[PDB]
Symmetry: C5
Subunit: 95 residues, 5 copies
């Protein structure tokens, strides 16, 4: 089952893994539409832990990058932060 | 079993996962023949949900990119949209 | 068990998956030795179907690229076509 | 379950796999914030063995790279060394 | 269990998979330290078969590349050849 999520830039965006039925496999991060040349980073913060940079995407150089991440119900607060002004599309599959 | 699909640009193209016997693993997106330098994106729309950018391919820079996507019979309407004028070949395997 | 195959350019080259004992996992395509700068593409044609571009390799920029392809005995005619004049080494493992 | 670790540069940093409940899958190395252009390498030393370079990251060119590494309780001393002055965020999942 | 091997350049280097307890997963090839700009290739020769190029690494452009290779006890003679003067670190995990 295909899975997708657009994580908007600016204000950091929360995400709830329990919304989906099964485990989320984040296998790709794709840069959204935009005009800024600045490097874009998506950071994942679990609970009160410090954010961990999932990947770095370079506009016009590397606009997509493979990922291998698994999100389940165990980490109750999942909070995605995106640097820059371009959205980052996370794609993958369920279970 | 090898699987392949050429998703044409321009008018967005529907796809029916039930045509194949088993689950489709989309493990690669390869840029088709063409002369345009513009960045090419393939977007996947499931049902009425907003399209999610699967990957971004740069002509003459990144003409192929690994993917890890699984398509099955559960998502009845699967609709592939390709930006640009170059076709995008999706390759992988069944089951 | 390691698996490898050099697919020569020019005249398109047939391949028989039944030669090996188990399923072939094509996990990498590496550009062979050569002097041409042109982009090299390996296309896979199964039966009478149209060729599907497996990957695109750029000399001096991207001379290798990860793949995730599975070839078994079910597809009787497997026919590899390579664009350019550089051979493409397919590497992986069996079963 | 998401896993993350920031490996600081400079003095080499020890890591204890037994802290986590399950096996650690290091599936990505992402360059941390910084201004240096020099290439950054994270080296893994197990026991008394010589360090093995896990990956090389180029600032402003390749700031993230996929990995497939599994760390468990069997290797008691695990010692991460990072070259350069930029931290390297290791991300993945447990078990 | 982490696995690592430094394959030296120059004279081609033999390797014995039976030294390790379990199957070797070669999931990454990282360029070693060096000053040469020439492209570096690691070739795998099994038995009397012709060498198959595992991957091609470009200094200062692509110093690491993901791999998916499995080496076991079945291929008795495994012989790694590295082009160039830079060593290539193979990293992965056992079993």
């Amino acid at each position: 089952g295909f899975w997708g999520l657009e994580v908007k830039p600016g204000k950091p965006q929360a995400y709830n893994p329990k919304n989906e039925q099964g485990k989320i496999h984040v296998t790709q991060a794709t840069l959204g539409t935009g005009l800024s040349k600045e490097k874009s980073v998506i950071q994942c913060s679990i609970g009160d832990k410090a954010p961990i940079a999932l990947c770095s995407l370079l506009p016009n150089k590397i606009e997509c990058c493979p990922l291998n991440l698994e999100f389940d119900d165990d980490d109750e607060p999942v909070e995605f932060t995106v640097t820059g002004d371009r959205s980052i599309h996370l794609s993958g599959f369920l279970e």
